[PDB]
């Protein structure tokens, strides 16, 4: 595993990560108080399957509950105590130690934008009237105010002033605590529309400068005011701007938007397909997560923007053979039967030496998506939902078949 920032200082940890999202939405209900135990038992399998990193659930305990129903998943934590719904503090340390010991770096989901302000029994008790909260200031709507330089979560009454020096430092110190005591190799930043991107750069500089970073900016052009250049920008431009200012890789919601709304041919318009390596190498690609996708259990999870059945293998073949940094969803890998296919694709990626900045060229004249990917060791030809017959139609050189699945709807050849 190679470390290192990008030529622009973006914390993509060498560009060679292959990430597992290590939970689904209903874990706290399907495996009560037992998930860290399961992750520890699975650590050697996760490593054998080829993952270099695991995105862990929010480690801060969350005892919220609402009624559709949910709660406890981590995104409405009430303090940093690790004895939450995924397992105990001791069980987390054991899981992180087993994962890191197997070569899987541990990335913690962290939620700075808000906390369960009203929870009656908690270690973090921030009064009103000192500037600790968004709503200490006038709050006319969902946009920055004088106590919060980003957007708000629902009504905003639980949004923290993350730029207040005491609140900034509270998170700074907890990121350091996760690194020194819980084996953190980096962080996944939740709801980054909620606070300044520069604050993520500051947090990482202070507490984990050489670690891996990724932020979730999920905000389409139409959510920006009419005077904001982002209101008429592409999804790529919006998330790339965030990554520039955070010095952090960013989830490729431009690719997700094309997978949900466009054709397979159109998947080339994700951030990870951009011909400028400074653009595509900061993309963190994914098929579904705990929010967009289904989960086992109640209500099928959230499924807010789920990829249809018929495209799952194509989508995994695309992200695992292409630039950017790919993320595999727990339930596709270990619940729903795509594991052997994904295992094969990870081996193909590693054997070809595809990394976050590998070149990718898209070919016209065929149906579907046809791409040539320049790995450090091999060239790949990838044909998804395509009438391409063979790689010699689009590439020079000698090729052999590496993947052929779904009646030829997923084909990969390697040089
Ligand atoms: Ca690395
Ligand atoms: Ca906020």
Curated annotation (Swiss-Prot):
Ca(2+) 1 binds at residues 1-2, 13, 16-17. The record marks 291 as: Transition state stabilizer. Pathway: Glycan degradation; starch degradation. This is Glucan 1,4-alpha-maltotetraohydrolase. It comes from the Bacteria. The keyword Disulfide bond applies. Ca(2+) 2 binds at residues 113, 148, 151, 159, 194. Coiled coil: none annotated. It catalyses: Hydrolysis of (1->4)-alpha-D-glucosidic linkages in amylaceous polysaccharides, to remove successive maltotetraose residues from the non-reducing chain ends. Disulfide bonds join 137-147, 213-248. It comes from Roseateles saccharophilus (Pseudomonas saccharophila). The chain holds residues 22 to 439 of 551 of the full protein. It is an enzyme of class 3 (hydrolase). Its cofactor is Ca(2+). The gene is mta. Binds 2 calcium ions per subunit. Keywords: Calcium, Carbohydrate metabolism, Disulfide bond, Glycosidase, Hydrolase, Metal-binding, Secreted, Signal. The keyword Hydrolase applies.
């Amino acid at each position: 595993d190679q470390a290192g920032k990008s030529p622009a200082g973006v914390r993509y940890h060498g560009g060679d990560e292959i990430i597992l999202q290590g939970f689904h939405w209903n874990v706290v209900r399907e495996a009560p108080n037992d998930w860290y135990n399961i992750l520890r038992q699975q650590a050697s399998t996760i490593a054998a399957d080829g993952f270099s990193a695991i995105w862990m659930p929010v480690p801060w305990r969350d005892f919220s509950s609402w009624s559709k129903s949910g709660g406890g998943e981590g995104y409405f934590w009430h303090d940093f105590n690790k004895n939450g719904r995924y397992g105990s503090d001791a069980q987390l340390r054991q899981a992180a130690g087993a994962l890191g010991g197997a070569g899987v770096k541990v990335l913690y989901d962290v939620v700075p934008n808000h906390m369960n302000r009203g929870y009656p029994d908690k270690e973090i008790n921030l009064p009103a009237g000192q500037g600790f909260w968004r709503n200490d200031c006038a709050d006319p709507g969902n946009y920055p105010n004088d106590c919060d330089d980003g957007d708000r979560f629902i009504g905003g009454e639980s949004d923290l002033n993350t730029g207040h020096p005491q609140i900034y430092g509270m998170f700074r110190d907890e990121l350091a605590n996760l690194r020194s005591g819980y084996g953190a190799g980096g962080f996944r930043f939740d709801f980054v529309r909620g606070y300044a991107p520069e604050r993520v750069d500051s947090w990482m500089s202070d507490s984990a400068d050489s670690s891996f970073c990724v932020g979730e900016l999920w905000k389409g052009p139409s959510e920006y005011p009419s005077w904001d250049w982002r209101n008429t920008a592409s999804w790529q431009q919006i998330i790339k701007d965030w990554s520039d200012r955070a010095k952090c890789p960013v989830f490729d919601f431009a690719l997700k938007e094309r997978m949900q709304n466009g054709s397979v041919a159109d998947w080339k318009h994700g951030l990870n397909g951009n011909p400028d390596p400074r653009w595509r190498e900061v993309a963190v690609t994914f098929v579904d997560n705990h929010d967009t996708g289904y989960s086992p259990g109640q209500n099928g999870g959230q499924h807010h923007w789920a990829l249809q059945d018929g495209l799952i293998r194509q989508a995994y073949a695309y992200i695992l053979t292409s630039p950017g940094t790919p993320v595999v969803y727990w339930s596709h890998m270990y619940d729903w039967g795509y594991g052997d296919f994904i295992r094969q694709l990870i081996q193909v990626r590693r054997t070809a030496g595809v990394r976050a900045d590998s070149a990718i060229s898209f070919h016209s004249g065929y149906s579907g998506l046809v791409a040539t990917v320049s790995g450090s060791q091999q060239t790949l030809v990838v044909a998804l939902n395509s009438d391409l017959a063979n790689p010699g139609q689009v590439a020079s050189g000698s090729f052999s078949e590496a993947v052929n699945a779904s009646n030829g709807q997923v084909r990969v050849w390697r040089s």
